[PDB]
PDB file of C-alpha atoms and ligand atoms in Angstrom:
ATOM      1  CA  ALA A   1     165.799 174.112 158.393  1.00  0.00           C
ATOM      2  CA  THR A   2     169.394 174.830 157.423  1.00  0.00           C
ATOM      3  CA  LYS A   3     170.786 172.307 154.950  1.00  0.00           C
ATOM      4  CA  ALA A   4     174.122 171.302 153.511  1.00  0.00           C
ATOM      5  CA  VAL A   5     175.369 168.709 151.027  1.00  0.00           C
ATOM      6  CA  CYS A   6     178.666 167.050 150.085  1.00  0.00           C
ATOM      7  CA  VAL A   7     179.672 165.092 146.973  1.00  0.00           C
ATOM      8  CA  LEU A   8     182.398 162.563 147.820  1.00  0.00           C
ATOM      9  CA  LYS A   9     184.996 161.685 145.157  1.00  0.00           C
ATOM     10  CA  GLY A  10     188.590 160.470 145.133  1.00  0.00           C
ATOM     11  CA  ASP A  11     191.305 158.764 143.113  1.00  0.00           C
ATOM     12  CA  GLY A  12     189.557 155.397 142.991  1.00  0.00           C
ATOM     13  CA  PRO A  13     186.033 154.128 142.766  1.00  0.00           C
ATOM     14  CA  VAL A  14     184.600 155.596 145.935  1.00  0.00           C
ATOM     15  CA  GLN A  15     181.769 158.064 145.540  1.00  0.00           C
ATOM     16  CA  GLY A  16     178.732 159.286 147.370  1.00  0.00           C
ATOM     17  CA  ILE A  17     176.330 162.063 148.318  1.00  0.00           C
ATOM     18  CA  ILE A  18     175.844 163.077 151.931  1.00  0.00           C
ATOM     19  CA  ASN A  19     173.099 165.407 153.163  1.00  0.00           C
ATOM     20  CA  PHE A  20     172.955 167.474 156.359  1.00  0.00           C
ATOM     21  CA  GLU A  21     169.943 169.130 157.978  1.00  0.00           C
ATOM     22  CA  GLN A  22     169.717 171.245 161.146  1.00  0.00           C
ATOM     23  CA  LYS A  23     166.092 172.113 161.887  1.00  0.00           C
ATOM     24  CA  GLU A  24     166.775 174.345 164.873  1.00  0.00           C
ATOM     25  CA  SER A  25     169.554 176.688 165.893  1.00  0.00           C
ATOM     26  CA  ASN A  26     172.068 174.677 167.944  1.00  0.00           C
ATOM     27  CA  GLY A  27     169.879 171.615 167.497  1.00  0.00           C
ATOM     28  CA  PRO A  28     170.850 168.183 166.220  1.00  0.00           C
ATOM     29  CA  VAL A  29     172.262 167.772 162.728  1.00  0.00           C
ATOM     30  CA  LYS A  30     170.884 164.862 160.709  1.00  0.00           C
ATOM     31  CA  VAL A  31     173.526 163.360 158.360  1.00  0.00           C
ATOM     32  CA  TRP A  32     172.384 160.863 155.728  1.00  0.00           C
ATOM     33  CA  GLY A  33     173.152 159.516 152.279  1.00  0.00           C
ATOM     34  CA  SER A  34     175.056 156.739 150.582  1.00  0.00           C
ATOM     35  CA  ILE A  35     178.619 155.890 149.636  1.00  0.00           C
ATOM     36  CA  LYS A  36     179.581 153.187 147.089  1.00  0.00           C
ATOM     37  CA  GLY A  37     182.847 151.536 146.056  1.00  0.00           C
ATOM     38  CA  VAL A  38     184.241 150.739 149.528  1.00  0.00           C
ATOM     39  CA  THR A  39     185.129 147.463 151.133  1.00  0.00           C
ATOM     40  CA  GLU A  40     182.613 145.671 153.344  1.00  0.00           C
ATOM     41  CA  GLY A  41     182.796 146.829 156.987  1.00  0.00           C
ATOM     42  CA  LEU A  42     183.526 149.971 158.914  1.00  0.00           C
ATOM     43  CA  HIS A  43     185.221 153.051 157.502  1.00  0.00           C
ATOM     44  CA  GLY A  44     186.279 156.186 159.393  1.00  0.00           C
ATOM     45  CA  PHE A  45     184.166 159.262 158.656  1.00  0.00           C
ATOM     46  CA  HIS A  46     185.218 162.757 159.703  1.00  0.00           C
ATOM     47  CA  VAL A  47     185.039 166.447 158.999  1.00  0.00           C
ATOM     48  CA  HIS A  48     188.566 167.763 158.362  1.00  0.00           C
ATOM     49  CA  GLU A  49     189.569 171.370 158.942  1.00  0.00           C
ATOM     50  CA  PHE A  50     190.084 172.789 155.440  1.00  0.00           C
ATOM     51  CA  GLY A  51     187.761 172.840 152.445  1.00  0.00           C
ATOM     52  CA  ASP A  52     190.894 172.552 150.252  1.00  0.00           C
ATOM     53  CA  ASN A  53     190.942 169.778 147.606  1.00  0.00           C
ATOM     54  CA  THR A  54     193.767 171.251 145.531  1.00  0.00           C
ATOM     55  CA  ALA A  55     195.907 168.075 145.843  1.00  0.00           C
ATOM     56  CA  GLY A  56     193.000 165.762 146.583  1.00  0.00           C
ATOM     57  CA  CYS A  57     191.961 164.692 150.050  1.00  0.00           C
ATOM     58  CA  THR A  58     195.339 165.243 151.697  1.00  0.00           C
ATOM     59  CA  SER A  59     194.891 169.007 151.311  1.00  0.00           C
ATOM     60  CA  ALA A  60     191.974 168.998 153.811  1.00  0.00           C
ATOM     61  CA  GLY A  61     194.461 168.774 156.690  1.00  0.00           C
ATOM     62  CA  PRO A  62     193.752 167.361 160.150  1.00  0.00           C
ATOM     63  CA  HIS A  63     190.402 166.660 161.853  1.00  0.00           C
ATOM     64  CA  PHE A  64     188.277 169.729 162.577  1.00  0.00           C
ATOM     65  CA  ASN A  65     189.225 170.417 166.194  1.00  0.00           C
ATOM     66  CA  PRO A  66     188.423 173.996 167.256  1.00  0.00           C
ATOM     67  CA  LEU A  67     188.335 173.035 170.960  1.00  0.00           C
ATOM     68  CA  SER A  68     191.779 171.372 171.100  1.00  0.00           C
ATOM     69  CA  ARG A  69     190.504 167.999 172.291  1.00  0.00           C
ATOM     70  CA  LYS A  70     191.713 164.455 171.746  1.00  0.00           C
ATOM     71  CA  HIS A  71     190.233 162.248 169.011  1.00  0.00           C
ATOM     72  CA  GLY A  72     187.298 160.102 169.994  1.00  0.00           C
ATOM     73  CA  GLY A  73     184.076 158.626 168.811  1.00  0.00           C
ATOM     74  CA  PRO A  74     180.901 160.515 168.234  1.00  0.00           C
ATOM     75  CA  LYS A  75     179.324 159.193 171.458  1.00  0.00           C
ATOM     76  CA  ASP A  76     182.224 160.394 173.588  1.00  0.00           C
ATOM     77  CA  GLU A  77     182.539 163.646 175.457  1.00  0.00           C
ATOM     78  CA  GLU A  78     186.257 163.744 174.547  1.00  0.00           C
ATOM     79  CA  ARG A  79     186.291 164.081 170.757  1.00  0.00           C
ATOM     80  CA  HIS A  80     187.101 166.487 167.955  1.00  0.00           C
ATOM     81  CA  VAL A  81     184.109 168.428 166.577  1.00  0.00           C
ATOM     82  CA  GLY A  82     184.691 166.576 163.247  1.00  0.00           C
ATOM     83  CA  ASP A  83     184.639 163.053 164.768  1.00  0.00           C
ATOM     84  CA  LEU A  84     181.642 161.250 163.204  1.00  0.00           C
ATOM     85  CA  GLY A  85     182.893 157.731 163.892  1.00  0.00           C
ATOM     86  CA  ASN A  86     182.461 155.013 161.257  1.00  0.00           C
ATOM     87  CA  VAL A  87     180.091 154.237 158.432  1.00  0.00           C
ATOM     88  CA  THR A  88     179.350 150.605 157.536  1.00  0.00           C
ATOM     89  CA  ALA A  89     179.403 149.136 154.017  1.00  0.00           C
ATOM     90  CA  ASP A  90     177.638 145.995 153.021  1.00  0.00           C
ATOM     91  CA  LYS A  91     178.934 143.183 150.902  1.00  0.00           C
ATOM     92  CA  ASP A  92     178.167 145.138 147.738  1.00  0.00           C
ATOM     93  CA  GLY A  93     180.432 147.892 148.905  1.00  0.00           C
ATOM     94  CA  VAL A  94     177.577 150.318 149.719  1.00  0.00           C
ATOM     95  CA  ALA A  95     177.284 152.237 153.009  1.00  0.00           C
ATOM     96  CA  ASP A  96     173.963 153.759 153.980  1.00  0.00           C
ATOM     97  CA  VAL A  97     174.806 156.637 156.238  1.00  0.00           C
ATOM     98  CA  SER A  98     172.414 157.724 158.967  1.00  0.00           C
ATOM     99  CA  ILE A  99     173.841 159.775 161.838  1.00  0.00           C
ATOM    100  CA  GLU A 100     172.417 162.387 164.210  1.00  0.00           C
ATOM    101  CA  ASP A 101     175.019 164.589 165.922  1.00  0.00           C
ATOM    102  CA  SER A 102     174.810 167.659 168.146  1.00  0.00           C
ATOM    103  CA  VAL A 103     178.475 168.654 168.305  1.00  0.00           C
ATOM    104  CA  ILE A 104     178.751 169.586 164.618  1.00  0.00           C
ATOM    105  CA  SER A 105     176.672 172.539 163.504  1.00  0.00           C
ATOM    106  CA  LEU A 106     175.655 174.321 160.325  1.00  0.00           C
ATOM    107  CA  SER A 107     176.415 177.764 161.948  1.00  0.00           C
ATOM    108  CA  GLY A 108     178.708 179.326 164.574  1.00  0.00           C
ATOM    109  CA  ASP A 109     182.123 178.207 165.735  1.00  0.00           C
ATOM    110  CA  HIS A 110     181.372 174.540 165.193  1.00  0.00           C
ATOM    111  CA  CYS A 111     180.130 175.131 161.669  1.00  0.00           C
ATOM    112  CA  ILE A 112     181.219 172.491 159.168  1.00  0.00           C
ATOM    113  CA  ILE A 113     180.148 174.292 156.036  1.00  0.00           C
ATOM    114  CA  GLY A 114     183.185 174.983 153.833  1.00  0.00           C
ATOM    115  CA  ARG A 115     185.135 172.143 155.453  1.00  0.00           C
ATOM    116  CA  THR A 116     185.848 168.684 153.992  1.00  0.00           C
ATOM    117  CA  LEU A 117     184.058 165.416 154.680  1.00  0.00           C
ATOM    118  CA  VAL A 118     186.392 162.412 154.351  1.00  0.00           C
ATOM    119  CA  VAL A 119     185.735 158.649 154.201  1.00  0.00           C
ATOM    120  CA  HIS A 120     188.739 156.507 155.076  1.00  0.00           C
ATOM    121  CA  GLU A 121     190.315 153.159 154.096  1.00  0.00           C
ATOM    122  CA  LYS A 122     190.214 151.627 157.553  1.00  0.00           C
ATOM    123  CA  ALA A 123     187.906 151.767 160.568  1.00  0.00           C
ATOM    124  CA  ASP A 124     188.332 154.531 163.104  1.00  0.00           C
ATOM    125  CA  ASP A 125     189.391 153.046 166.462  1.00  0.00           C
ATOM    126  CA  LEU A 126     187.655 155.941 168.273  1.00  0.00           C
ATOM    127  CA  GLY A 127     190.682 156.737 170.368  1.00  0.00           C
ATOM    128  CA  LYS A 128     190.686 153.186 171.912  1.00  0.00           C
ATOM    129  CA  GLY A 129     193.707 151.779 169.981  1.00  0.00           C
ATOM    130  CA  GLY A 130     196.449 152.133 172.596  1.00  0.00           C
ATOM    131  CA  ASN A 131     199.019 153.935 170.395  1.00  0.00           C
ATOM    132  CA  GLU A 132     199.635 157.683 170.121  1.00  0.00           C
ATOM    133  CA  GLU A 133     197.915 158.059 166.713  1.00  0.00           C
ATOM    134  CA  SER A 134     194.721 156.618 168.101  1.00  0.00           C
ATOM    135  CA  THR A 135     193.910 159.851 169.993  1.00  0.00           C
ATOM    136  CA  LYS A 136     194.807 161.972 166.876  1.00  0.00           C
ATOM    137  CA  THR A 137     193.457 160.196 163.787  1.00  0.00           C
ATOM    138  CA  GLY A 138     191.867 157.015 165.113  1.00  0.00           C
ATOM    139  CA  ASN A 139     194.218 155.015 162.816  1.00  0.00           C
ATOM    140  CA  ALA A 140     191.678 155.283 160.003  1.00  0.00           C
ATOM    141  CA  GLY A 141     194.385 155.349 157.346  1.00  0.00           C
ATOM    142  CA  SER A 142     194.187 156.656 153.836  1.00  0.00           C
ATOM    143  CA  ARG A 143     191.565 158.998 152.499  1.00  0.00           C
ATOM    144  CA  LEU A 144     189.488 157.254 149.857  1.00  0.00           C
ATOM    145  CA  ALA A 145     187.119 160.083 148.963  1.00  0.00           C
ATOM    146  CA  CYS A 146     186.220 163.584 150.097  1.00  0.00           C
ATOM    147  CA  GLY A 147     184.336 166.721 149.220  1.00  0.00           C
ATOM    148  CA  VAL A 148     183.680 170.216 150.434  1.00  0.00           C
ATOM    149  CA  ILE A 149     180.522 170.658 152.507  1.00  0.00           C
ATOM    150  CA  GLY A 150     178.330 173.216 150.742  1.00  0.00           C
ATOM    151  CA  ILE A 151     175.187 175.195 151.550  1.00  0.00           C
ATOM    152  CA  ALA A 152     172.106 173.403 150.161  1.00  0.00           C
ATOM    153  CA  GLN A 153     168.710 174.714 149.178  1.00  0.00           C
TER     154      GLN A 153
ATOM    155  CA  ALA B   1     187.899 183.051 157.939  1.00  0.00           C
ATOM    156  CA  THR B   2     190.730 184.996 156.257  1.00  0.00           C
ATOM    157  CA  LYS B   3     191.439 182.587 153.396  1.00  0.00           C
ATOM    158  CA  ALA B   4     189.385 180.379 151.104  1.00  0.00           C
ATOM    159  CA  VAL B   5     190.035 178.246 148.032  1.00  0.00           C
ATOM    160  CA  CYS B   6     188.087 176.700 145.156  1.00  0.00           C
ATOM    161  CA  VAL B   7     189.029 173.983 142.664  1.00  0.00           C
ATOM    162  CA  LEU B   8     187.137 174.593 139.410  1.00  0.00           C
ATOM    163  CA  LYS B   9     186.478 171.565 137.243  1.00  0.00           C
ATOM    164  CA  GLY B  10     184.456 170.887 134.116  1.00  0.00           C
ATOM    165  CA  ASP B  11     184.470 169.117 130.768  1.00  0.00           C
ATOM    166  CA  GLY B  12     187.343 170.129 128.483  1.00  0.00           C
ATOM    167  CA  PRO B  13     189.114 169.718 130.789  1.00  0.00           C
ATOM    168  CA  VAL B  14     188.490 173.142 132.272  1.00  0.00           C
ATOM    169  CA  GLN B  15     190.638 173.324 135.426  1.00  0.00           C
ATOM    170  CA  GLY B  16     191.536 176.046 137.843  1.00  0.00           C
ATOM    171  CA  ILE B  17     192.483 176.904 141.390  1.00  0.00           C
ATOM    172  CA  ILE B  18     191.093 180.170 142.760  1.00  0.00           C
ATOM    173  CA  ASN B  19     192.280 181.659 146.033  1.00  0.00           C
ATOM    174  CA  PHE B  20     190.512 184.181 148.239  1.00  0.00           C
ATOM    175  CA  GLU B  21     192.025 186.324 151.009  1.00  0.00           C
ATOM    176  CA  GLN B  22     190.428 188.871 153.309  1.00  0.00           C
ATOM    177  CA  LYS B  23     192.645 190.675 155.808  1.00  0.00           C
ATOM    178  CA  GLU B  24     189.814 191.812 158.061  1.00  0.00           C
ATOM    179  CA  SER B  25     186.042 191.436 157.891  1.00  0.00           C
ATOM    180  CA  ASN B  26     185.601 195.054 156.991  1.00  0.00           C
ATOM    181  CA  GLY B  27     188.010 194.826 154.057  1.00  0.00           C
ATOM    182  CA  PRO B  28     187.873 193.612 150.490  1.00  0.00           C
ATOM    183  CA  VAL B  29     188.410 190.074 149.303  1.00  0.00           C
ATOM    184  CA  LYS B  30     191.310 189.475 146.921  1.00  0.00           C
ATOM    185  CA  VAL B  31     190.486 186.761 144.404  1.00  0.00           C
ATOM    186  CA  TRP B  32     193.327 185.309 142.311  1.00  0.00           C
ATOM    187  CA  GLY B  33     194.434 182.217 140.462  1.00  0.00           C
ATOM    188  CA  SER B  34     194.391 180.628 137.068  1.00  0.00           C
ATOM    189  CA  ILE B  35     191.888 178.814 134.868  1.00  0.00           C
ATOM    190  CA  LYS B  36     192.876 176.696 131.862  1.00  0.00           C
ATOM    191  CA  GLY B  37     190.984 175.069 129.007  1.00  0.00           C
ATOM    192  CA  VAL B  38     188.612 177.881 127.954  1.00  0.00           C
ATOM    193  CA  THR B  39     188.227 179.857 124.764  1.00  0.00           C
ATOM    194  CA  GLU B  40     190.178 183.091 124.283  1.00  0.00           C
ATOM    195  CA  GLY B  41     188.300 186.169 125.561  1.00  0.00           C
ATOM    196  CA  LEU B  42     185.950 187.088 128.401  1.00  0.00           C
ATOM    197  CA  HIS B  43     184.010 184.556 130.491  1.00  0.00           C
ATOM    198  CA  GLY B  44     181.396 185.297 133.124  1.00  0.00           C
ATOM    199  CA  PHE B  45     182.516 184.600 136.685  1.00  0.00           C
ATOM    200  CA  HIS B  46     180.096 184.445 139.623  1.00  0.00           C
ATOM    201  CA  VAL B  47     179.367 183.029 142.999  1.00  0.00           C
ATOM    202  CA  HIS B  48     176.156 181.018 142.841  1.00  0.00           C
ATOM    203  CA  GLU B  49     173.862 180.408 145.808  1.00  0.00           C
ATOM    204  CA  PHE B  50     174.277 176.729 146.619  1.00  0.00           C
ATOM    205  CA  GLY B  51     177.435 174.715 147.283  1.00  0.00           C
ATOM    206  CA  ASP B  52     175.623 171.749 145.647  1.00  0.00           C
ATOM    207  CA  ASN B  53     177.430 169.910 142.860  1.00  0.00           C
ATOM    208  CA  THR B  54     175.290 166.785 142.947  1.00  0.00           C
ATOM    209  CA  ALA B  55     174.342 167.045 139.259  1.00  0.00           C
ATOM    210  CA  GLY B  56     177.242 169.198 138.328  1.00  0.00           C
ATOM    211  CA  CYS B  57     177.232 172.972 137.989  1.00  0.00           C
ATOM    212  CA  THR B  58     173.467 173.301 137.389  1.00  0.00           C
ATOM    213  CA  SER B  59     172.827 172.233 141.013  1.00  0.00           C
ATOM    214  CA  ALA B  60     174.445 175.442 142.264  1.00  0.00           C
ATOM    215  CA  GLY B  61     171.267 177.368 141.410  1.00  0.00           C
ATOM    216  CA  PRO B  62     171.091 181.102 140.647  1.00  0.00           C
ATOM    217  CA  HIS B  63     173.646 183.818 141.398  1.00  0.00           C
ATOM    218  CA  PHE B  64     174.170 184.440 145.101  1.00  0.00           C
ATOM    219  CA  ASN B  65     171.741 187.320 145.689  1.00  0.00           C
ATOM    220  CA  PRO B  66     170.822 187.710 149.369  1.00  0.00           C
ATOM    221  CA  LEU B  67     169.482 191.284 148.822  1.00  0.00           C
ATOM    222  CA  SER B  68     167.246 190.354 145.935  1.00  0.00           C
ATOM    223  CA  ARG B  69     168.848 192.968 143.605  1.00  0.00           C
ATOM    224  CA  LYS B  70     169.235 192.911 139.823  1.00  0.00           C
ATOM    225  CA  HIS B  71     172.258 191.424 138.069  1.00  0.00           C
ATOM    226  CA  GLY B  72     175.064 193.862 137.364  1.00  0.00           C
ATOM    227  CA  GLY B  73     178.781 194.220 136.954  1.00  0.00           C
ATOM    228  CA  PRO B  74     181.080 194.207 139.952  1.00  0.00           C
ATOM    229  CA  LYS B  75     181.484 198.025 139.871  1.00  0.00           C
ATOM    230  CA  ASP B  76     177.754 198.680 140.018  1.00  0.00           C
ATOM    231  CA  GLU B  77     175.715 199.328 143.227  1.00  0.00           C
ATOM    232  CA  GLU B  78     172.860 197.422 141.723  1.00  0.00           C
ATOM    233  CA  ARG B  79     174.344 193.920 141.499  1.00  0.00           C
ATOM    234  CA  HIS B  80     174.083 190.526 143.084  1.00  0.00           C
ATOM    235  CA  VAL B  81     176.586 189.815 145.832  1.00  0.00           C
ATOM    236  CA  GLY B  82     177.956 187.040 143.620  1.00  0.00           C
ATOM    237  CA  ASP B  83     178.557 189.252 140.531  1.00  0.00           C
ATOM    238  CA  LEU B  84     182.318 189.158 139.854  1.00  0.00           C
ATOM    239  CA  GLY B  85     182.080 190.196 136.214  1.00  0.00           C
ATOM    240  CA  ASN B  86     184.332 188.504 133.673  1.00  0.00           C
ATOM    241  CA  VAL B  87     187.737 186.875 133.594  1.00  0.00           C
ATOM    242  CA  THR B  88     189.843 186.985 130.421  1.00  0.00           C
ATOM    243  CA  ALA B  89     191.590 184.046 128.762  1.00  0.00           C
ATOM    244  CA  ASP B  90     194.470 184.373 126.360  1.00  0.00           C
ATOM    245  CA  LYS B  91     195.167 182.645 123.073  1.00  0.00           C
ATOM    246  CA  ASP B  92     196.355 179.533 124.908  1.00  0.00           C
ATOM    247  CA  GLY B  93     193.040 179.340 126.780  1.00  0.00           C
ATOM    248  CA  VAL B  94     194.417 180.433 130.164  1.00  0.00           C
ATOM    249  CA  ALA B  95     192.845 183.121 132.343  1.00  0.00           C
ATOM    250  CA  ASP B  96     194.903 184.738 135.064  1.00  0.00           C
ATOM    251  CA  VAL B  97     192.339 185.899 137.589  1.00  0.00           C
ATOM    252  CA  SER B  98     193.089 188.975 139.710  1.00  0.00           C
ATOM    253  CA  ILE B  99     190.108 190.675 141.330  1.00  0.00           C
ATOM    254  CA  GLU B 100     189.549 192.785 144.437  1.00  0.00           C
ATOM    255  CA  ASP B 101     185.906 192.945 145.551  1.00  0.00           C
ATOM    256  CA  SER B 102     184.274 194.830 148.402  1.00  0.00           C
ATOM    257  CA  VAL B 103     180.828 193.177 148.298  1.00  0.00           C
ATOM    258  CA  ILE B 104     181.660 189.479 148.718  1.00  0.00           C
ATOM    259  CA  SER B 105     183.046 188.409 152.125  1.00  0.00           C
ATOM    260  CA  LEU B 106     184.582 185.408 153.817  1.00  0.00           C
ATOM    261  CA  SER B 107     182.390 185.972 156.895  1.00  0.00           C
ATOM    262  CA  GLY B 108     179.031 187.522 157.837  1.00  0.00           C
ATOM    263  CA  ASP B 109     175.878 187.631 155.794  1.00  0.00           C
ATOM    264  CA  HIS B 110     177.705 188.117 152.409  1.00  0.00           C
ATOM    265  CA  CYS B 111     179.899 185.139 153.163  1.00  0.00           C
ATOM    266  CA  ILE B 112     180.658 183.052 150.109  1.00  0.00           C
ATOM    267  CA  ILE B 113     182.157 180.072 152.047  1.00  0.00           C
ATOM    268  CA  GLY B 114     180.222 176.944 151.118  1.00  0.00           C
ATOM    269  CA  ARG B 115     178.809 178.444 147.892  1.00  0.00           C
ATOM    270  CA  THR B 116     179.804 177.598 144.307  1.00  0.00           C
ATOM    271  CA  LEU B 117     182.159 179.551 142.051  1.00  0.00           C
ATOM    272  CA  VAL B 118     181.226 179.215 138.341  1.00  0.00           C
ATOM    273  CA  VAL B 119     183.015 180.194 135.134  1.00  0.00           C
ATOM    274  CA  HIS B 120     180.773 180.486 132.095  1.00  0.00           C
ATOM    275  CA  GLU B 121     180.783 179.783 128.333  1.00  0.00           C
ATOM    276  CA  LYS B 122     180.036 183.384 127.303  1.00  0.00           C
ATOM    277  CA  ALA B 123     180.930 186.820 128.541  1.00  0.00           C
ATOM    278  CA  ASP B 124     178.682 188.414 131.161  1.00  0.00           C
ATOM    279  CA  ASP B 125     176.963 191.509 129.706  1.00  0.00           C
ATOM    280  CA  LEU B 126     176.820 193.074 133.175  1.00  0.00           C
ATOM    281  CA  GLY B 127     173.103 193.754 132.996  1.00  0.00           C
ATOM    282  CA  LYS B 128     173.411 196.032 129.973  1.00  0.00           C
ATOM    283  CA  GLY B 129     172.128 193.732 127.291  1.00  0.00           C
ATOM    284  CA  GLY B 130     168.811 194.335 125.696  1.00  0.00           C
ATOM    285  CA  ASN B 131     166.879 191.478 127.124  1.00  0.00           C
ATOM    286  CA  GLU B 132     165.232 190.492 130.385  1.00  0.00           C
ATOM    287  CA  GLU B 133     167.862 187.761 131.088  1.00  0.00           C
ATOM    288  CA  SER B 134     170.577 190.383 131.105  1.00  0.00           C
ATOM    289  CA  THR B 135     169.523 191.657 134.552  1.00  0.00           C
ATOM    290  CA  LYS B 136     169.304 188.037 135.873  1.00  0.00           C
ATOM    291  CA  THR B 137     172.224 186.051 134.410  1.00  0.00           C
ATOM    292  CA  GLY B 138     174.060 188.556 132.207  1.00  0.00           C
ATOM    293  CA  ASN B 139     173.557 186.155 129.289  1.00  0.00           C
ATOM    294  CA  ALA B 140     176.745 184.310 130.298  1.00  0.00           C
ATOM    295  CA  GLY B 141     175.415 180.999 129.052  1.00  0.00           C
ATOM    296  CA  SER B 142     176.437 177.538 130.076  1.00  0.00           C
ATOM    297  CA  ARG B 143     178.473 176.668 133.087  1.00  0.00           C
ATOM    298  CA  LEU B 144     181.910 175.471 131.992  1.00  0.00           C
ATOM    299  CA  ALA B 145     183.343 174.598 135.399  1.00  0.00           C
ATOM    300  CA  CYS B 146     182.582 175.028 139.075  1.00  0.00           C
ATOM    301  CA  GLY B 147     183.610 174.100 142.556  1.00  0.00           C
ATOM    302  CA  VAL B 148     182.574 174.696 146.152  1.00  0.00           C
ATOM    303  CA  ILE B 149     184.395 177.509 148.018  1.00  0.00           C
ATOM    304  CA  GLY B 150     186.160 176.059 151.044  1.00  0.00           C
ATOM    305  CA  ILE B 151     187.965 177.384 154.094  1.00  0.00           C
ATOM    306  CA  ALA B 152     191.711 177.448 153.499  1.00  0.00           C
ATOM    307  CA  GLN B 153     194.649 177.456 155.880  1.00  0.00           C
TER     308      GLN B 153
HETATM  309 CL1   CL C   1     180.662 154.631 167.391  1.00  0.00          CL
HETATM  310 CL1   CL C   2     183.584 194.832 134.554  1.00  0.00          CL
HETATM  311 CU1   CU C   3     189.137 161.763 158.542  1.00  0.00          CU
HETATM  312 CU1   CU C   4     177.470 182.293 137.130  1.00  0.00          CU
HETATM  313 ZN1   ZN C   5     189.302 163.194 165.288  1.00  0.00          ZN
HETATM  314 ZN1   ZN C   6     174.290 188.105 138.950  1.00  0.00          ZN
END
């Protein structure tokens, strides 16, 4: 299988390790791991275009959107390639991440390797929020931690 | 694509930002930037196989070596793809990096996107030391700082 990994860090207490595995060419990508230091509830979770952390998470730019679509949720046909929805933290501030997605890839034009994974302050409204930002960013707010997605063994 | 970036970090603090640019896929990659916090003199400088920083720089594994060749200097035919030689720090502990390399790439099978850039404790002996490690690691010693190479705007 092809594999990738991302270490999430930021300016505050949020940190985690996220794994990716794609067993078959153009097949589903399994995304799993854990994030700690976040508030209980849902937090937006996306791949952003640039693997640039020079000024922290802001340097990663907008959502990864090679097909020029509107923002949505991962279950929607209308979404950015990088739109992985929300992750959910428990009362301890720990989110167990377990996603399977077939729009991201670990090769080709939808490849996410070398791009940035970002966990946000607020929930992503999945494009359902009724204001213009909703179909751009999902209103997920500030970037609490990020990392560059790297090739894994 | 045509640009990449890497934020190097390690204990010291050792800190740097390294940029990569490739005009066309059949051309060389320019590698430039600055590294601070290291001892005066030459330090080994390589792309390692994995973009995995989970336990720091050790997690990046061996030099990026898709052809299974021996370790060398950047000028040599017999080298690893990731063998970028040495960078040189001044009395103030700052290295100004300025390399052009024809073997690394920002696309294709020698693509370094999603891999780890590492600066070392010691100089790289370019495979011309007397010992068996010379033609594996160049005897560059510990890993002072690293980061994952990301796609840049
Ligand atoms: Cl959802
Ligand atoms: Cl040299
Ligand atoms: Cu995001
Ligand atoms: Cu090295
Ligand atoms: Zn989006
Ligand atoms: Zn080498």
